[PDB]
Design a protein around this ligand. Sequence first.
Ligand SMILES: Nc1ncnc2c1ncn2[C@@H]1O[C@H](COP(=O)(O)OP(=O)(O)OP(=O)(O)O)[C@@H](O)[C@H]1O
Ligand SMILES: Nc1ncnc2c1ncn2[C@@H]1O[C@H](COP(=O)(O)OP(=O)(O)OP(=O)(O)O)[C@@H](O)[C@H]1O
Ligand SMILES: CC(C)CCC[C@@H](C)[C@H]1CC[C@H]2[C@@H]3CC=C4C[C@@H](O)CC[C@]4(C)[C@H]3CC[C@]12C
Ligand SMILES: O=C(O)c1ccc(/C=C2\SC(=S)N(c3cccc(C(F)(F)F)c3)C2=O)cc1
Ligand SMILES: [Mg+2]
Ligand SMILES: [Mg+2]
Length: 1132
Amino acid sequence: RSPLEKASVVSKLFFSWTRPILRKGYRQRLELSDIYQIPSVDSADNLSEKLEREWDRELASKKNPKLINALRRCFFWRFMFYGIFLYLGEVTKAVQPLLLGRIIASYDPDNKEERSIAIYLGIGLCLLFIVRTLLLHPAIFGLHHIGMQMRIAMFSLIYKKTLKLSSRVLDKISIGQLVSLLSNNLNKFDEGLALAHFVWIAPLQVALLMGLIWELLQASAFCGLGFLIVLALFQAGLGRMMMKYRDQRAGKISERLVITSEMIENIQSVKAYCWEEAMEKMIENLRQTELKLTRKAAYVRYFNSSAFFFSGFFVVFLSVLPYALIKGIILRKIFTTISFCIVLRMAVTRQFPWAVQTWYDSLGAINKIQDFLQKQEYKTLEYNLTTTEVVMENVTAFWEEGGTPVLKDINFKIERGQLLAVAGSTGAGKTSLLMVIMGELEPSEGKIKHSGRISFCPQFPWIMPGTIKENIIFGVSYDEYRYRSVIKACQLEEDISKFPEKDNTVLGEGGITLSGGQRAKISLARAVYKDADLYLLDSPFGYLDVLTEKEIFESCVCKLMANKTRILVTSKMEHLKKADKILILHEGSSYFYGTFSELQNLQWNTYLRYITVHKSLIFVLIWCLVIFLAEVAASLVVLWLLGVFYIYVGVADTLLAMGFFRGLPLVHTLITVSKILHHKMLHSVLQAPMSTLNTLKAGGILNRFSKDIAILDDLLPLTIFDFIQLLLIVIGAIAVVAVLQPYIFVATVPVIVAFIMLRAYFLQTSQQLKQLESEGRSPIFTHLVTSLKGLWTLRAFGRQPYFETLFHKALNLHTANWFLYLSTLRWFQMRIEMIFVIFFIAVTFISILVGIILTLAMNIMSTLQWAVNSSIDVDSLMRSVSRVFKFIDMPTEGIWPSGGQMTVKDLTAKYTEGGNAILENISFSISPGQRVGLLGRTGSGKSTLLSAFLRLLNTEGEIQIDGVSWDSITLQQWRKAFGVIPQKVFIFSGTFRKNLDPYEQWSDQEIWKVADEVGLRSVIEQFPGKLDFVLVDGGCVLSHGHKQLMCLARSVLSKAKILLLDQPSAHLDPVTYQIIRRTLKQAFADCTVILCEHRIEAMLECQQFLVIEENKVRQYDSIQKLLNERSLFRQA
Ligand SMILES: Nc1ncnc2c1ncn2[C@@H]1O[C@H](COP(=O)(O)OP(=O)(O)OP(=O)(O)O)[C@@H](O)[C@H]1O
Ligand SMILES: Nc1ncnc2c1ncn2[C@@H]1O[C@H](COP(=O)(O)OP(=O)(O)OP(=O)(O)O)[C@@H](O)[C@H]1O
Ligand SMILES: CC(C)CCC[C@@H](C)[C@H]1CC[C@H]2[C@@H]3CC=C4C[C@@H](O)CC[C@]4(C)[C@H]3CC[C@]12C
Ligand SMILES: O=C(O)c1ccc(/C=C2\SC(=S)N(c3cccc(C(F)(F)F)c3)C2=O)cc1
Ligand SMILES: [Mg+2]
Ligand SMILES: [Mg+2]
């Protein structure tokens, strides 16, 4: 447990509770187990319940609900308490020049105003620093805590809202927009709470400072105020210009995010198609405009950030010269004026615009989140009592809100214990009918009445990340008899037994470990397990062979649940013979409704590697340093004309300030560095081996492409520039001041060496906890992605609270990782402040017990601390560059085809190294121009063989076509001889023409010819733009029977002499399969296809069969030869 729960007031004030973890992490590795727990204040379950109540009251009471009016009622008073503490701690910063000016008047020659007083003031001056230190840091920590609490509460509200979104609203929502929204205010929201209080402190500080200065300059104190007001107007005009270049980049960032995620999810098909070259350019073109906007917005921000270092001369000039004209000036007042003007310049030009910008951004983010919260919701409205019968009459529905209806005049009725089987050609609307039943689709006319309890089995299998037992159970009480019977009747015995961990293995997001014929079985078992009234199954036997389908239908759909009503999407005749009713849709219309009899009768090392990527960075750093060398040599050897050099030193901020000749090129180069880094990282990811790529997850990519690159684009340039500016200011003033007085320069050496040693000591833990928390924010992303993916099988089942609890657990883990760093960085900053005051209690006290050397020592000892803080910020930010380089440094896996004859010798396929060998000593041959038909059971390894042909997985054999082996040619040129049709169809966000070919090498005539040949003429032309419609949501507009057709058209367009057909027809009806056959015969009359289809009527157009069994291949010749040994395959 965290010690903050049980800690004394002084212990919490000194933050001394991070000492044990810091000591452990400095000399040992930090592990998740040895991490402080979470308290009861930061728990999401309570921190969201405290806000949902207020939000609901606002929604039900007000006429114009506001989220800020609900956040105020919770986090107002603590925020105001820390604001008051901040104001009290900052009032003590404008009165420090007053004490220096009332000390200097004492060490004025021959016994000036007060003589026996310097003892009183020389101690109180530095003792006031202790009070400032005590008052400042706790308020900052409290404000950070409040910001983090608001962030987690709003995130939980967003997740609770995102599970009630309608199907209509999901059209405009992409898996990239939400990720970008989270990544924006994931860490820049809670950090800005401290800066938000400087909107009412800066004016009061300005008023107090003006009142103080007026006692020095009678009426000349207002010219400097006028100049500073003009500068503040200029900065406020720069802010609005910067905003315009920030609200246009978000859309491009989201678009790039969705395209990158869609590519990385199924990089397998990209590699098979050899689309990497044409798909890196598609991202580079998008990145160009983002870079242009970022480069335009990184100059205005620099100009805003450089108005403090270029204002320390004009303000002093305008303050002193008008008064010096009428009365001259004294060398005592001319320094108190500068000491006041420094604080005034900071509070006007650095603290006010930052607060204004923070308020603007916070209000904008809150309003955006409120707009997300106020969207259309999904209603159920069903009745929980009936006669256990499902009847709907005269239902007509439109998918799009506006167009052609999808369903019209469909009526049916089924009692309890009956089975209704629906069928029809592709595009008829069977899935839409089941959606109408489920309620995810609102009919425009009609009514559906049935009991609420239903069970769903989607056409596309869904595998949430967890054990097989958890996947099958799906958040209910575990059973031993029902579960075992289901697992036996769904044919999941042998496949589960093959695993080393028998039942509870681990499956990743999407079930990549499992094949395509076992995910369907798991989904069917999950649907069967649930105790519901109606089991609406949407074509469960999609990726199952004929024998498995026959064995499952008679033992799971008619023997296990033969007393509960179930609606099945059929595509065969044996499934209709045993049916109780039949409904044959056609183009969204009830073509038939009746029984089968009537149907029959009817018819360190990162900094050096970061700057050396681009040579212009070195050529600009040398140019920005040698000019500083000349500038500092124009203030050390030209002094023989003067010797009052203290006044000259006092304006070192303006003297050594970077202009627009040495800062603009550096800023411009620092973005080109990020561009090159991102391009190299994307290329190295695209050209990586599959064994290395499979280690990566779907949450480990949006955490490295969305936030990590955004850091390098946005935050690193200006932070590095500011740190460099502070370094130059400190060095070129300490070196100068070491000439006049070399005794006060001595004190700055031990301070610097202690600062560097302590910072390097604390980095030993901040470089392993910061990375821990930066990688610990991936679970929430990877759970949000899958919860959005399974949003239609979640609401149908009813398991919403289970996912809510999972998300709460993930949020708790992230906050537990975050609080430790948020506390240890504060501890180290406060200890730096303490060593500062400890080494400062002596410098003035011993020297006092010239009186103006004190103001220079105090103007240097604060710039040193500011530079130290900037260095800490840069070191914290460079972890992103470190992870970019880690992600780049990855292994690289990298007319001839006339006849197309094959030969394999001693082939071994294994997806991993040292794992189970899927294929062992494979050998066969293929006569050229001869079709070959693969065969086998589920889990045999057909797709494994097809992948081993293209060498996606590591192999140990040789395959040669037309006399050239594997080694004689490169992988990229070898892989171009094959035209594949992957089992997982790939559709990305783009136009139809772009999807059909990314390289854009075929004209619209050539595209239309193939589209009409395959049969997409009636599908492309039903959309507002033919061959120009922007398919989105992963091609969700199309249907499962049209996705396969488009994939086959893509295969036909690209002509190859060898092609690996991996189940060309997955869910196609028998009528549309004639199109597949008329394309196969008339377009593949010269190439040697390798079929994988499970259709018995399709397995007859072959000449050489390959059956995979027990990790070996047997090749037969006659069609009936292989159907005689095993009688099961013939009887089934
Ligand atoms: N990424 C992977 N890593 C390790 N093993 C895998 C991976 N993908 C699949 N397998 C294993 O491969 C075995 C069989 O190979 P594959 O997954 O290609 O199935 P298959 O027999 O071709 O499938 P089907 O006939 O159902 O389409 C499966 O039992 C599974 O354990
Ligand atoms: N989200 C959507 N928005 C707009 N139109 C859609 C959407 N989903 C499907 N459609 C279209 O509406 C019709 C309904 O097709 P649907 O997907 O219901 O067919 P199906 O019976 O499931 O077909 P299949 O044989 O491919 O499984 C099709 O013309 C399809 O292209
Ligand atoms: C924090 C703010 C609101 C407090 C009110 C403004 C303060 C800073 C201003 C208002 C009037 C000012 C005073 C006006 C006149 C004099 C008389 C002179 O012999 C010493 C300075 C002194 C005493 C000024 C000190 C600063 C002063 C007190
Ligand atoms: O509250 C804060 O964050 C805070 C408060 C105060 C400051 C002070 C600063 S910054 C800067 S530059 N100078 C300066 C100006 C002229 C000359 C010199 C010299 F002598 F060192 F060269 C240094 C300061 O005095 C920074 C931050
Ligand atoms: Mg379907
Ligand atoms: Mg397969």
